[PDB]
Design a protein around this ligand. Structure first.
Ligand SMILES: CCCCCCCCCCCCO[C@@H]1O[C@H](CO)[C@@H](O[C@H]2O[C@H](CO)[C@@H](O)[C@H](O)[C@H]2O)[C@H](O)[C@H]1O
Ligand SMILES: CCCCCCCCCCCCO[C@@H]1O[C@H](CO)[C@@H](O[C@H]2O[C@H](CO)[C@@H](O)[C@H](O)[C@H]2O)[C@H](O)[C@H]1O
Ligand SMILES: CCCCCCCCCCCCO[C@@H]1O[C@H](CO)[C@@H](O[C@H]2O[C@H](CO)[C@@H](O)[C@H](O)[C@H]2O)[C@H](O)[C@H]1O
Lengths: 101, 87, 75, 189, 40
């Protein structure tokens, strides 16, 4: 079989064995024994800006593994793509959208 | 055949939904995944890298609508206090 | 005739008939996104059936006249 | 004299099994219903995280490594995390999100039959290609193998030059999702 | 001209139009505001 497959199974098996020791040996007991408040908008912004910048950085990864062919024409277009995304970053820096300062 | 099944699932998410407006966000994304997966499988069948590029741009627009949508849902919640439809 | 059937089978009967119809259709609009989404799917399927089953166009007009007269009846 | 066509099992270049695809598709379907039936929006999003990974694995298992990894990095890494944030913070009463699904069960048979019976015919032969059975034959080439590129390198070769207008329009879509989402949510200053 | 089997065509008309109305009845069941169930 492939090494990747046998590796995932082995990691899976080790996890089962460590779990089994807890179930087999560790002590067990049958006895296993409402408000509202606004949440900070900051939590939304952290995932929002991450999601957008993560996509933009992702779109740049193909350029890095194709630079010999993209060359000067590709560099130019990738710089125009960098500049547009940077201007959006300066906007979140300008409005302290992250509400960190 | 898997791509059509998942497109039904997203569609049936709208068929079976009277109260969840969150589940309509989820069902839109299942429909986008089915359409991107169809383009991706037909791309491998025709040796065309342009299908992979179109799939990538559908993933970017899909995330951008998720951001625009969950932001509007946050604006709505701030004043309403519930995301529930009084049915 | 003049103050009777000419106004009943005419402006006054079209007035009271249409106002009743328009209130019923206007009562389909409940501003629920869940119910509006169902309508779009319904109107989607009817377009798919019509332009794939090669149905006689007259079959459509019967549907519209049926639908319109169903909103003409209250309750 | 003996059969000219001979069938043998490959030994060290034997690829993967078609079965894994029937397993992943069945898993993708099963979690798909669980999304649209679960009472808790949290559990639905978790079943969505499960679905996105089944499709990602199917793509990586058929050779689409960069897009499958991209799906894993974007959908599970970022899109669903934003979904957990909003869901784990909004006050959700689960009884107010439950509807009588049985009332909607007849329309589910109707819509499923009609939509499937139309869309299926529309697909191309190669999506529905899968008792004598066809087998897909492949051979080797030399001139077209001189400098083979990974798919990301091939996407990169054309993404920033020939089809650069798509990058420009997407950069402005992301730019709009940045400015617009902040303007509708944050209190200025 | 070629005679048409009126009874045979009549069933086709009833099923085609009655099928669409059955789809309309289904929307009514889905949109019903009480636990009427599937057999409604
Ligand atoms: C994840 C892979 C699949 C699982 C593989 C391992 C499975 C192990 C199953 C057997 C586990 C036995 O573990 C044992 O369970 C019993 C029953 O709950 C516990 O017993 C405990 O609860 C019972 C409840 O009636 C009490 O009467 C008893 O006095 C108390 O000690 C033991 O304290 C625990 O040590
Ligand atoms: C390639 C990398 C390029 C990097 C470019 C860097 C961006 C430069 C332009 C943006 C910075 C200037 O924009 C400036 O941002 C700062 C920091 O939020 C703001 O700072 C001010 O407002 C915010 C919000 O009330 C307060 O939290 C902060 O304490 C206050 O000093 C200024 O009001 C704004 O004018
Ligand atoms: C010389 C005659 C020239 C006529 C030219 C064309 C005039 C317009 C033709 C249609 C007129 C509308 O005709 C009218 O439609 C509405 C339909 O809701 C009906 O109006 C009424 O229906 C029933 C009575 O039967 C009532 O209980 C109901 O309250 C009311 O809506 C009348 O039954 C009909 O008379």
């Amino acid at each position: 079989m492939s090494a990747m497959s046998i590796y995932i199974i082995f990691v899976s098996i080790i996890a089962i064995l460590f779990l089994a020791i807890d179930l087999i040996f560790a002590p067990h007991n049958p006895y296993k024994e409402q408000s509202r408040s606004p949440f900070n908008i900051s939590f939304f912004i952290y995932g929002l800006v991450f999601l957008l910048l993560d996509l933009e950085i992702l779109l740049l990864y193909p350029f890095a593994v194709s630079e010999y062919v993209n060359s000067a024409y590709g560099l130019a277009a990738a710089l125009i793509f960098i500049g547009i995304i940077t201007i959006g970053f300066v906007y979140e820096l300008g409005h302290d959208a992250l509400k960190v300062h | 055949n898997i791509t059509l099944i998942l497109f039904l699932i997203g569609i049936l998410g709208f068929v079976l939904n009277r109260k969840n407006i969150i589940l309509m966000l989820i069902s839109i994304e299942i429909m986008l995944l089915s359409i991107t997966f169809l383009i991706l499988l037909s791309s491998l069948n025709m040796d065309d890298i342009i299908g992979q590029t179109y799939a990538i741009y559908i993933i970017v627009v899909a995330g951008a609508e998720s951001a625009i949508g969950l932001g509007i849902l946050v604006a709505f919640y701030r004043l309403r206090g519930s995301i529930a439809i009084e049915y | 005739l003049d103050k009777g059937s000419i106004e009943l089978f005419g402006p006054y009967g079209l007035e009271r008939g249409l106002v009743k119809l328009s209130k019923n259709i206007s009562s389909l609009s409940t501003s629920h996104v869940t119910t509006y989404a169902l309508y779009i799917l319904v109107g989607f399927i009817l377009y798919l059936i019509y332009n794939n089953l090669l149905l006689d166009y007259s079959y459509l007009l019967l549907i519209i006249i049926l639908l319109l007269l169903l909103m003409m009846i209250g309750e | 004299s003996q059969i000219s066509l001979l069938l043998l099992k490959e030994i060290y270049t034997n690829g993967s099994t078609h079965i894994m695809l029937d397993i992943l598709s069945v898993l993708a379907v099963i979690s798909g219903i669980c999304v649209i039936i679960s009472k808790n929006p949290i559990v639905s999003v978790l079943h969505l995280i499960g679905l996105f990974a089944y499709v990602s694995f199917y793509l990586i298992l058929i050779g689409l490594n960069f897009v499958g990894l991209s799906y894993l990095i974007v959908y599970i890494g970022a899109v669903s995390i934003l979904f957990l944030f909003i869901l784990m913070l909004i006050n959700i009463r689960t009884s107010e999100l439950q509807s009588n699904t049985s009332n909607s069960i007849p329309l589910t048979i109707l819509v499923g039959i009609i939509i499937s019976s139309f869309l299926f015919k529309m697909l191309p032969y190669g999506v529905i290609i899968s008792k004598n059975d066809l087998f897909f034959i492949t051979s080797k080439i030399w001139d077209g193998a001189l400098a083979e590129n990974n798919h990301i390198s091939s996407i990169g070769n054309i993404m920033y030059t020939n089809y650069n207008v798509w990058l420009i329009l997407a950069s402005f879509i992301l730019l709009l999702a940045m400015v617009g989402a902040i303007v509708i949510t944050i209190k200025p200053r | 001209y070629h005679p048409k089997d009126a009874v045979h065509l009549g069933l086709k008309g009833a099923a085609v139009v009655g099928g669409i109305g059955l789809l309309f009845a289904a929307v009514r069941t889905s949109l019903a505001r009480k636990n009427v169930g599937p057999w409604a």
